[PDB]
Amino acid sequence: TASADSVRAYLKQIGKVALLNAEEEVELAKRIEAGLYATQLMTELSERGEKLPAAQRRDMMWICRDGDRAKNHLLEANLRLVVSLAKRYTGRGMAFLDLIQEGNLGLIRAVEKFDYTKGYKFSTYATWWIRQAITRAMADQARTIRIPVHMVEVINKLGRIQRELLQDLGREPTPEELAKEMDITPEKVLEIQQYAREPISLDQTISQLGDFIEDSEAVVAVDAVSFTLLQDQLQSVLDTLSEREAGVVRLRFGLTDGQPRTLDEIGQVYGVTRERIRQIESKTMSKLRHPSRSQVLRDYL
Amino acid sequence: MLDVNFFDELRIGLATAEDIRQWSYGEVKKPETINYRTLKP
Amino acid sequence: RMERVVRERMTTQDVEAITPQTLINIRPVVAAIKEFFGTSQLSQFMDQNNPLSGLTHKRRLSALGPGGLSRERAGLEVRDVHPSHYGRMCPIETPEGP
Amino acid sequence: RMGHIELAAPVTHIWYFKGVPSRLGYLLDLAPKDLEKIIYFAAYVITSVDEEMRHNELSTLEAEMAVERKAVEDQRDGELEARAQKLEADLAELEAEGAKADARRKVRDGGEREMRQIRDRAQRELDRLEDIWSTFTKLAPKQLIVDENLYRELVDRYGEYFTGAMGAESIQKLIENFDIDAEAESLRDVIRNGKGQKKLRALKRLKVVAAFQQSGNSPMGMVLDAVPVIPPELRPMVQLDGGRFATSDLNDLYRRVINRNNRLKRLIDLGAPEIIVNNEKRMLQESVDALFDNGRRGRPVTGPGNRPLKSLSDLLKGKQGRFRQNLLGKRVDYSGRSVIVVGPQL
Amino acid sequence: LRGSRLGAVSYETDRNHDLAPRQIARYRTDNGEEFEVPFADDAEIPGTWLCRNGMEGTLIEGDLPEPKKVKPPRTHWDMLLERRSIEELEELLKERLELIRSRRRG
DNA sequence: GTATTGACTTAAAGTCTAACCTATAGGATACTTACAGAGGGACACGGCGAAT
RNA sequence: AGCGA
DNA sequence: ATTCGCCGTGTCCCTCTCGCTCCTATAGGTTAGACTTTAAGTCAATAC
């Protein structure tokens, strides 16, 4: 047998309960609405309300539990509608079961927000609610990257237009062609193509691509020691100059803590004015541009 | 986690839920990876 | 594949309104041809380092392929030279590798 | 750095369920064929029993069953009386006119056959009642129950006396209520005194039982409540030059589990029927089993191009596991190669 | 054929010489669990924080600025009341009440 | 060389408005069961026969 | 996917 | 019919190395974009 198919097991499961008709649906809807109002009234009467008479409390609690019963009965009734609807979409989505469950969520929404006084079979409203929920969940859970609904819709419209034009014309149209067809810009079309891209799988057969994936962002393995020696040389050169000049440069360019101190802060910490320090900075940088202080640093670019 | 060549035993063992949620640094609860537009997690 | 699509829409499409232009789909046919010529272990890259190699890569017989025996199943049994090869398949030339 | 996912419903680990020999099967003394039906929500399991309460409400409910079967016999002798009146009507309408000797009694045979099949109906339903009563009398804990209708009747008429549940949480409850020490000593007695298949099975099981007893290992970890998540650089999405992203094929599985867990959480918050909730728990189970070893139980979860996905188990199994690809050799820095020539003057 | 990550090499090795002076804050969870998170001198401690466990945790020092609940979720009660009326639902309740009455005691 | 004051332009924020993405809810005729489309050694789950 | 020892 | 001893069949992990080339409607968040302010950097002259 090898009965490990949850699909067939679930179908066999949902085949147990019988399908219903319009008057039965009206009865169930009335029962659920009455049960909900009963629970609401009992909560209201439990808080600063009234000591519910034993018999009244009893039969209204019965009404509540029976409303829940009817809700569940209806959901069991229309599971088959869910599967029948879900069949069309499968082929471009996830596990069938996921779509079925989204359909069930749409059903509980529909049975929550159904009205019987309009005198209609429940099937249509159920259908629309189901489809809305399925499409929403499919979109939210389609790709490893998330693409919100309106952009999903324009992507689908672009795809349908391109496919029908391929069927009719026979050639793949152009970005300007799709821009004029969809009343949008060619750059927008290009962006929709770009965001339409789906990730490739690191796992493949060729071997796996993961083998040949150079780590362009990684240890350079030479610039590390290069920067170490660089810093050593800068400390040396700064020691060659005056200590005040060296400290001023270190604070100006953040060589001591990584925090770049500016003219007002350095003038404050040296007890002088920012123009004084600007003169200091200009003279020191002019001193540094003199090649004897720069022959040992020129090669570091 | 981080040590030196001090090694005498490699003990495998069946893990427990307290051990798992003590291992972890947070509770992932959303099925998303990267923002499609800015390419940030 | 084309035929399955055609017969599928051959019912859904309304009658007295359709034509082979609206019925036929050439996308899967062109895709099949392209997927054969590219990325198939018989649509081999032309091995032309000398004119003789250009000739000999053609006329080449390969027993491994789709609908064929890969080296996993292509054991020694099929690698010998049955006496029927005389005049039909050279016994000498064959790659020295696996 | 790792993550974890808190599961709204405990889920059984796959290795200790499916890999033959089944470790849960040997720990709980359950057949794998019947344990699959439990952890995949195909059958219920009784995880407790109160023999005293059953023992006295046995008298009370046997009186109730006598009442029920006497009502059944009230219906049955109602059938007898009604068909007897109809049969005397057949008398008055077949032996009171001019008719054929056999055609006047074809209605006789019709009514008698109606009573025969009607008492067949009554007998078969009474036999069903006797069967269910006998099942209740001989019910025990740690026991399997198929026939959802039978289980539903059993619970809603005997909701006490036991905790009958379905799935991973029921297995958790069984492991909770399980003295390893007395059971191990019982297996020790069985291997002390027994013979043949019984002793052989005792050895096979005592293996894992004593394995768990000797260590400080609780068997609670066999069923799972928080599933860890591997650090992201080990399942990276590296972009290729051109925006073609490259996921690691574990992100889709971790998604599947996250989406199904959140769907379960919302369903339980909202209030959903038993069918939907149990189905959701089954999908959560399947998602976790696929995450840990895809292709082990049932159809392997495919990807685009009908390619099976690479779960965690597949990262170690076979020739392409870590135990080989980076342990059968590594590329090394400060290396080179070249063709060689003979160096006779060296 | 190559790839990169949105990361910073920041070739700086390590510095234990100067660490931006920092105290440590603590936000106990709802189940007697404490998960310390360090915070700088210039750090503006939150009233409550997403702790290491995952659930929301409040600072040990007693502040309690206002949990400030958000809009109730759309309850089936909500979508029923926004399209029906109290008197009509009450009439329905009486209908089913008398229904079960007449069913029970006749 | 070192430390100042008074224009004179400049980058870095701060803000206001805003404008443009983005997440969410709903759509009320009828609409009721997925799909399928090698070989070898070894062990464990199970045929065939004598005994009580 | 193809190829050399 | 169960026991114990044989056979028999079905399901599963493993096998050289190295290289090369569908739509609508709301409400809220985000960023963006430009106008305005301010600390900031510069230049010219100067006195000691």
XYZ file of N, CA and C in Angstrom, chain D residues 87-289:
609
model
N -48.468 -8.507 7.664
C -48.571 -9.872 7.167
C -50.002 -10.380 7.270
N -50.715 -9.992 8.326
C -52.133 -10.319 8.405
C -52.943 -9.503 7.400
N -52.486 -8.294 7.071
C -53.074 -7.567 5.950
C -52.840 -8.309 4.639
N -51.639 -8.867 4.466
C -51.372 -9.713 3.311
C -52.310 -10.911 3.293
N -52.568 -11.502 4.460
C -53.558 -12.572 4.548
C -54.908 -12.093 4.033
N -55.381 -10.965 4.566
C -56.709 -10.461 4.244
C -56.825 -9.971 2.806
N -55.704 -9.721 2.127
C -55.729 -9.249 0.747
C -55.194 -10.266 -0.254
N -54.770 -11.443 0.198
C -54.354 -12.521 -0.687
C -55.250 -13.746 -0.609
N -55.755 -14.090 0.574
C -56.669 -15.214 0.735
C -58.128 -14.777 0.742
N -58.409 -13.523 0.385
C -59.763 -12.987 0.368
C -60.266 -12.675 -1.035
N -59.476 -12.952 -2.071
C -59.858 -12.688 -3.452
C -59.493 -13.892 -4.309
N -59.857 -13.824 -5.587
C -59.487 -14.854 -6.537
C -58.115 -14.597 -7.122
N -57.146 -15.441 -6.778
C -55.761 -15.223 -7.172
C -55.070 -16.574 -7.313
N -53.794 -16.527 -7.685
C -52.997 -17.725 -7.890
C -52.452 -18.239 -6.562
N -52.263 -19.560 -6.489
C -51.880 -20.189 -5.229
C -50.509 -19.726 -4.752
N -49.595 -19.432 -5.676
C -48.258 -18.984 -5.298
C -48.146 -17.465 -5.267
N -48.806 -16.768 -6.197
C -48.741 -15.312 -6.206
C -49.339 -14.716 -4.938
N -50.298 -15.406 -4.319
C -50.849 -14.932 -3.057
C -49.847 -15.057 -1.917
N -48.855 -15.940 -2.043
C -47.831 -16.121 -1.022
C -46.484 -15.532 -1.412
N -46.355 -14.957 -2.609
C -45.144 -14.206 -2.911
C -45.019 -13.012 -1.979
N -46.147 -12.391 -1.624
C -46.121 -11.360 -0.591
C -45.769 -11.969 0.763
N -46.192 -13.210 1.020
C -45.758 -13.904 2.229
C -44.239 -13.955 2.304
N -43.607 -14.438 1.232
C -42.153 -14.533 1.214
C -41.515 -13.153 1.262
N -42.142 -12.160 0.630
C -41.600 -10.811 0.682
C -41.566 -10.261 2.093
N -42.666 -10.419 2.830
C -42.693 -9.961 4.211
C -41.748 -10.744 5.103
N -41.687 -12.065 4.917
C -40.775 -12.870 5.721
C -39.323 -12.497 5.438
N -38.990 -12.245 4.170
C -37.644 -11.812 3.815
C -37.361 -10.412 4.346
N -38.380 -9.551 4.376
C -38.219 -8.244 4.997
C -37.861 -8.392 6.468
N -38.543 -9.297 7.173
C -38.215 -9.534 8.576
C -36.825 -10.151 8.715
N -36.441 -11.024 7.781
C -35.115 -11.638 7.833
C -34.019 -10.588 7.687
N -34.130 -9.723 6.681
C -33.115 -8.689 6.522
C -33.216 -7.630 7.619
N -34.408 -7.410 8.179
C -34.558 -6.426 9.247
C -33.901 -6.922 10.531
N -34.098 -8.198 10.868
C -33.394 -8.756 12.015
C -31.910 -8.881 11.728
N -31.518 -9.000 10.454
C -30.102 -8.884 10.129
C -29.578 -7.490 10.464
N -30.343 -6.450 10.122
C -29.957 -5.085 10.479
C -29.824 -4.939 11.990
N -30.854 -5.373 12.721
C -30.841 -5.255 14.175
C -29.693 -6.049 14.779
N -29.447 -7.256 14.266
C -28.372 -8.088 14.779
C -27.013 -7.455 14.520
N -26.807 -6.877 13.333
C -25.504 -6.294 13.037
C -25.259 -5.034 13.864
N -26.286 -4.203 14.067
C -26.079 -3.022 14.903
C -25.892 -3.411 16.368
N -26.620 -4.427 16.837
C -26.397 -4.921 18.191
C -24.997 -5.502 18.334
N -24.509 -6.189 17.297
C -23.150 -6.715 17.324
C -22.132 -5.587 17.369
N -22.401 -4.493 16.656
C -21.550 -3.311 16.766
C -21.530 -2.792 18.199
N -22.698 -2.744 18.840
C -22.761 -2.276 20.225
C -21.989 -3.208 21.160
N -22.126 -4.520 20.963
C -21.367 -5.468 21.771
C -19.873 -5.300 21.540
N -19.474 -5.084 20.286
C -18.064 -4.887 19.972
C -17.513 -3.652 20.670
N -18.256 -2.544 20.643
C -17.749 -1.323 21.263
C -17.699 -1.477 22.781
N -18.691 -2.154 23.370
C -18.632 -2.394 24.809
C -17.436 -3.264 25.174
N -17.198 -4.332 24.408
C -16.051 -5.190 24.676
C -14.750 -4.414 24.530
N -14.674 -3.541 23.524
C -13.485 -2.720 23.340
C -13.250 -1.817 24.542
N -14.308 -1.177 25.044
C -14.150 -0.351 26.236
C -13.692 -1.188 27.424
N -14.275 -2.378 27.591
C -13.904 -3.228 28.718
C -12.438 -3.638 28.637
N -11.955 -3.954 27.437
C -10.590 -4.424 27.234
C -9.655 -3.335 26.727
N -10.087 -2.076 26.742
C -9.195 -0.982 26.389
C -8.060 -0.877 27.403
N -6.913 -0.402 26.939
C -5.730 -0.282 27.778
C -4.975 0.964 27.354
N -3.988 1.391 28.137
C -3.198 2.565 27.758
C -2.107 2.201 26.759
N -1.451 3.241 26.245
C -0.391 3.072 25.253
C -0.892 2.255 24.069
N -2.142 2.489 23.674
C -2.826 1.599 22.746
C -3.326 2.364 21.529
N -3.374 1.678 20.393
C -3.783 2.298 19.143
C -5.290 2.195 18.954
N -5.847 3.179 18.246
C -7.274 3.237 17.948
C -7.420 3.785 16.535
N -7.893 2.946 15.621
C -8.228 3.338 14.258
C -9.750 3.380 14.221
N -10.337 3.760 13.084
C -11.780 3.980 13.015
C -12.188 5.203 13.833
N -11.837 6.375 13.300
C -12.220 7.679 13.827
C -13.614 7.698 14.445
N -14.607 7.067 13.809
C -15.942 7.035 14.400
C -15.926 6.298 15.735
N -15.242 5.152 15.778
C -15.111 4.406 17.021
C -14.439 5.256 18.085
N -13.356 5.940 17.713
C -12.657 6.766 18.693
C -13.541 7.899 19.196
N -14.274 8.554 18.294
C -15.118 9.675 18.695
C -16.199 9.213 19.660
N -16.846 8.089 19.348
C -17.844 7.547 20.265
C -17.205 7.203 21.607
N -16.021 6.588 21.566
C -15.335 6.199 22.790
C -15.062 7.409 23.673
N -14.533 8.485 23.091
C -14.212 9.663 23.895
C -15.487 10.321 24.411
N -16.458 10.568 23.530
C -17.597 11.373 23.945
C -18.568 10.609 24.835
N -18.404 9.291 24.983
C -19.145 8.554 25.997
C -18.308 8.167 27.206
N -16.983 8.158 27.083
C -16.062 7.800 28.154
C -14.920 8.804 28.218
N -15.240 10.096 28.117
C -14.211 11.121 28.028
C -13.214 11.096 29.167
N -13.597 10.532 30.304
C -12.703 10.360 31.436
C -11.919 9.067 31.229
N -11.286 8.574 32.292
C -10.686 7.241 32.311
C -9.389 7.156 31.518
N -9.045 8.197 30.765
C -7.900 8.112 29.868
C -7.703 9.450 29.176
N -6.493 9.643 28.665
C -6.172 10.730 27.750
C -5.863 10.083 26.407
N -6.850 10.123 25.498
C -6.669 9.648 24.152
C -6.425 10.826 23.233
N -5.227 10.871 22.656
C -4.847 11.988 21.800
C -4.380 11.464 20.451
N -3.785 12.324 19.628
C -3.325 11.912 18.308
C -2.082 12.706 17.949
N -0.970 12.006 17.745
C 0.204 12.612 17.150
C 1.383 12.840 18.073
N 2.200 13.833 17.710
C 3.472 14.044 18.390
C 3.271 14.389 19.857
N 2.236 15.166 20.178
C 2.006 15.505 21.580
C 1.579 14.277 22.375
N 0.804 13.382 21.759
C 0.462 12.130 22.430
C 1.707 11.285 22.675
N 2.617 11.242 21.701
C 3.871 10.515 21.893
C 4.676 11.145 23.025
N 4.706 12.478 23.072
C 5.348 13.184 24.176
C 4.737 12.769 25.507
N 3.408 12.708 25.577
C 2.751 12.324 26.820
C 3.123 10.901 27.217
N 3.181 9.994 26.241
C 3.584 8.623 26.537
C 4.995 8.579 27.102
N 5.922 9.315 26.489
C 7.295 9.315 26.990
C 7.347 9.931 28.382
N 6.523 10.951 28.638
C 6.430 11.505 29.986
C 6.029 10.430 30.984
N 4.936 9.724 30.697
C 4.437 8.671 31.581
C 5.049 7.334 31.161
N 6.339 7.193 31.463
C 7.073 5.980 31.109
C 8.225 5.820 32.095
N 8.100 4.850 32.997
C 9.190 4.492 33.896
C 10.170 3.610 33.133
N 11.369 4.133 32.877
C 12.376 3.338 32.184
C 12.891 2.220 33.081
N 12.996 2.468 34.388
C 13.679 1.527 35.273
C 12.911 0.216 35.403
N 11.620 0.296 35.730
C 10.828 -0.919 35.896
C 10.694 -1.665 34.577
N 10.524 -0.933 33.476
C 10.441 -1.572 32.166
C 11.748 -2.276 31.812
N 12.885 -1.647 32.115
C 14.174 -2.268 31.842
C 14.368 -3.520 32.684
N 13.962 -3.472 33.954
C 14.052 -4.669 34.784
C 13.094 -5.753 34.303
N 11.947 -5.368 33.742
C 11.051 -6.353 33.144
C 11.701 -7.021 31.940
N 12.362 -6.233 31.090
C 13.096 -6.814 29.969
C 14.229 -7.704 30.467
N 14.854 -7.318 31.579
C 15.888 -8.148 32.187
C 15.314 -9.483 32.651
N 14.130 -9.465 33.257
C 13.473 -10.712 33.640
C 13.141 -11.556 32.414
N 12.670 -10.909 31.347
C 12.291 -11.640 30.143
C 13.509 -12.299 29.508
N 14.639 -11.594 29.457
C 15.852 -12.225 28.942
C 16.449 -13.196 29.955
N 16.032 -13.119 31.220
C 16.452 -14.109 32.207
C 15.741 -15.441 31.994
N 14.449 -15.400 31.653
C 13.609 -16.593 31.698
C 13.051 -17.056 30.355
N 13.070 -16.223 29.317
C 12.372 -16.509 28.082
C 13.227 -17.250 27.070
N 12.681 -17.367 25.861
C 13.331 -18.124 24.802
C 12.820 -17.651 23.450
N 13.617 -17.920 22.418
C 13.163 -17.710 21.052
C 12.934 -16.248 20.716
N 11.899 -16.016 19.902
C 11.626 -14.681 19.379
C 11.417 -13.674 20.501
N 10.803 -14.103 21.603
C 10.528 -13.173 22.693
C 11.829 -12.646 23.280
N 12.763 -13.552 23.580
C 14.054 -13.131 24.107
C 14.830 -12.316 23.082
N 14.751 -12.691 21.803
C 15.458 -11.929 20.778
C 14.964 -10.486 20.739
N 13.644 -10.302 20.708
C 13.073 -8.960 20.721
C 13.443 -8.226 22.001
N 13.454 -8.940 23.129
C 13.859 -8.327 24.386
C 15.282 -7.800 24.294
N 16.181 -8.565 23.676
C 17.547 -8.088 23.482
C 17.563 -6.833 22.618
N 16.892 -6.889 21.462
C 16.903 -5.752 20.545
C 16.408 -4.482 21.226
N 15.383 -4.599 22.071
C 14.809 -3.415 22.710
C 15.618 -2.983 23.929
N 15.961 -3.933 24.800
C 16.805 -3.678 25.957
C 18.066 -2.944 25.537
N 18.533 -3.175 24.310
C 19.648 -2.395 23.788
C 19.413 -0.898 23.988
N 18.392 -0.349 23.322
C 18.143 1.087 23.403
C 17.666 1.477 24.797
N 16.912 0.601 25.459
C 16.371 0.935 26.776
C 17.505 1.160 27.771
N 18.444 0.213 27.844
C 19.602 0.374 28.711
C 20.509 1.492 28.221
N 20.568 1.721 26.905
C 21.323 2.860 26.395
C 20.808 4.159 26.998
N 19.486 4.312 27.058
C 18.921 5.514 27.658
C 19.073 5.513 29.173
N 18.931 4.350 29.809
C 19.020 4.287 31.266
C 20.413 4.667 31.760
N 21.460 4.139 31.123
C 22.810 4.305 31.654
C 23.227 5.771 31.682
N 22.928 6.514 30.622
C 23.366 7.898 30.527
C 22.433 8.802 31.328
N 22.728 10.099 31.307
C 21.852 11.090 31.898
C 20.868 11.626 30.880
N 20.682 10.885 29.791
C 19.863 11.328 28.671
C 18.393 11.068 28.971
N 17.613 12.131 29.051
C 16.170 11.963 29.055
C 15.686 11.689 27.631
N 14.707 10.802 27.444
C 14.147 10.588 26.105
C 13.154 11.648 25.659
N 13.081 12.787 26.352
C 12.177 13.846 25.926
C 12.633 14.476 24.617
N 13.938 14.463 24.344
C 14.469 15.101 23.150
C 14.103 14.411 21.852
N 13.569 13.190 21.924
C 13.150 12.479 20.722
C 12.062 13.253 19.988
N 11.083 13.785 20.728
C 10.095 14.713 20.188
C 10.619 16.127 20.400
N 10.262 17.030 19.487
C 10.907 18.329 19.370
C 9.900 19.455 19.554
N 10.354 20.550 20.170
C 9.537 21.730 20.428
C 10.139 23.014 19.873
N 11.463 23.097 19.776
C 12.144 24.254 19.210
C 13.187 23.757 18.225
N 13.015 24.104 16.954
C 13.867 23.608 15.875
C 14.957 24.643 15.611
N 16.238 24.288 15.703
C 17.289 25.283 15.481
C 17.462 25.616 14.006
N 18.069 26.778 13.771
C 18.256 27.334 12.438
C 19.739 27.597 12.232
N 20.263 27.100 11.118
C 21.707 27.084 10.847
C 22.179 28.500 10.529
N 23.414 28.873 10.873
C 23.850 30.247 10.640
C 23.805 30.605 9.167
N 23.504 31.869 8.851
C 23.118 32.201 7.473
C 24.247 32.067 6.474
N 25.491 32.313 6.890
C 26.606 32.177 5.964
C 26.789 30.737 5.511
N 26.244 29.773 6.249
C 26.277 28.383 5.828
C 25.127 28.040 4.890
N 24.154 28.943 4.748
C 23.086 28.816 3.754
C 22.920 30.144 3.018
N 24.005 30.692 2.475
C 23.967 32.076 1.996
C 23.167 32.229 0.711
N 22.658 33.442 0.491
C 22.233 33.872 -0.840
C 23.304 34.854 -1.296
N 24.238 34.368 -2.093
C 25.247 35.219 -2.704
C 24.734 35.656 -4.067
N 24.788 36.955 -4.335
C 24.412 37.450 -5.649
C 25.525 37.163 -6.640
N 25.138 36.760 -7.840
C 26.079 36.695 -8.943
C 26.103 38.043 -9.655
N 27.134 38.247 -10.464
C 27.304 39.516 -11.168
C 26.190 39.643 -12.201
N 25.153 40.405 -11.858
C 24.001 40.563 -12.722
C 22.675 40.467 -11.991
N 22.717 40.280 -10.674
C 21.514 40.211 -9.871
C 20.879 38.842 -9.772
N 21.448 37.828 -10.416
C 20.920 36.467 -10.339
C 21.330 35.887 -8.992
N 20.404 35.907 -8.038
C 20.696 35.480 -6.678
C 20.855 33.963 -6.612
N 21.600 33.510 -5.600
C 21.966 32.099 -5.446
C 21.660 31.644 -4.020
N 20.420 31.234 -3.772
C 20.066 30.680 -2.475
C 20.737 29.321 -2.284
N 20.599 28.772 -1.078
C 21.293 27.550 -0.689
C 20.365 26.349 -0.535
N 19.091 26.484 -0.900
C 18.163 25.358 -0.959
C 17.705 24.892 0.420
N 18.289 25.438 1.487
C 17.741 25.269 2.826
C 16.810 26.404 3.208
N 16.948 27.555 2.552
C 16.087 28.688 2.855
C 14.640 28.388 2.500
N 14.407 27.663 1.404
C 13.033 27.319 1.048
C 12.422 26.354 2.063
N 13.217 25.413 2.578
C 12.705 24.505 3.601
C 12.411 25.251 4.897
N 13.342 26.103 5.334
C 13.107 26.900 6.533
C 11.887 27.787 6.355
N 11.704 28.342 5.162
C 10.447 29.016 4.888
C 9.285 28.075 5.139
N 9.174 27.001 4.349
C 8.046 26.074 4.479
C 7.686 25.837 5.944
N 8.689 25.560 6.784
C 8.382 25.322 8.194
C 7.841 26.596 8.844
N 8.428 27.758 8.537
C 7.964 28.996 9.164
C 6.532 29.319 8.743
N 6.235 29.222 7.444
C 4.882 29.535 6.989
C 3.870 28.595 7.622
N 4.177 27.295 7.656
C 3.209 26.360 8.216
C 3.053 26.559 9.720
N 4.140 26.885 10.422
C 4.035 27.151 11.852
C 3.183 28.385 12.123
N 3.395 29.459 11.361
C 2.597 30.666 11.555
C 1.135 30.420 11.204
N 0.881 29.644 10.150
C -0.493 29.300 9.811
C -1.150 28.515 10.939
N -0.426 27.557 11.521
C -0.958 26.827 12.669
C -1.252 27.771 13.825
N -0.328 28.691 14.104
C -0.506 29.611 15.220
C -1.755 30.459 15.023
N -1.937 30.997 13.817
C -3.128 31.795 13.555
C -4.386 30.939 13.624
N -4.331 29.706 13.113
C -5.509 28.849 13.160
C -5.929 28.574 14.597
N -4.966 28.282 15.473
C -5.316 27.994 16.862
C -5.793 29.258 17.569
N -5.179 30.406 17.267
C -5.656 31.658 17.849
C -7.094 31.939 17.436
N -7.406 31.721 16.158
C -8.720 32.049 15.621
C -9.791 31.066 16.071
N -9.443 29.787 16.207
C -10.423 28.758 16.499
C -10.866 28.069 15.227
N -10.389 26.852 15.002
C -10.608 26.126 13.764
C -11.064 24.709 14.062
N -11.767 24.071 13.128
C -12.235 22.703 13.362
C -11.087 21.709 13.470
N -11.411 20.577 14.102
C -10.420 19.535 14.339
C -9.784 19.069 13.036
N -10.581 18.924 11.978
C -10.034 18.454 10.706
C -8.940 19.400 10.222
N -9.231 20.702 10.196
C -8.259 21.663 9.688
C -7.028 21.697 10.584
N -7.225 21.714 11.905
C -6.084 21.836 12.807
C -5.183 20.608 12.711
N -5.770 19.410 12.694
C -4.960 18.200 12.599
C -4.264 18.109 11.250
N -4.942 18.510 10.171
C -4.265 18.568 8.883
C -3.073 19.509 8.939
N -3.247 20.673 9.564
C -2.148 21.621 9.650
C -0.983 21.036 10.433
N -1.275 20.345 11.532
C -0.204 19.715 12.296
C 0.502 18.650 11.463
N -0.251 17.926 10.630
C 0.374 16.955 9.736
C 1.311 17.634 8.740
N 0.884 18.753 8.152
C 1.766 19.458 7.219
C 3.002 19.995 7.926
N 2.841 20.483 9.157
C 4.004 20.919 9.925
C 4.971 19.763 10.143
N 4.441 18.596 10.515
C 5.278 17.414 10.674
C 6.043 17.119 9.391
N 5.327 17.046 8.264
C 5.972 16.727 6.994
C 7.037 17.753 6.643
N 6.775 19.029 6.922
C 7.765 20.057 6.634
C 9.032 19.838 7.451
N 8.883 19.504 8.734
C 10.066 19.259 9.559
C 10.815 18.018 9.074
N 10.086 16.954 8.721
C 10.756 15.750 8.236
C 11.505 16.028 6.942
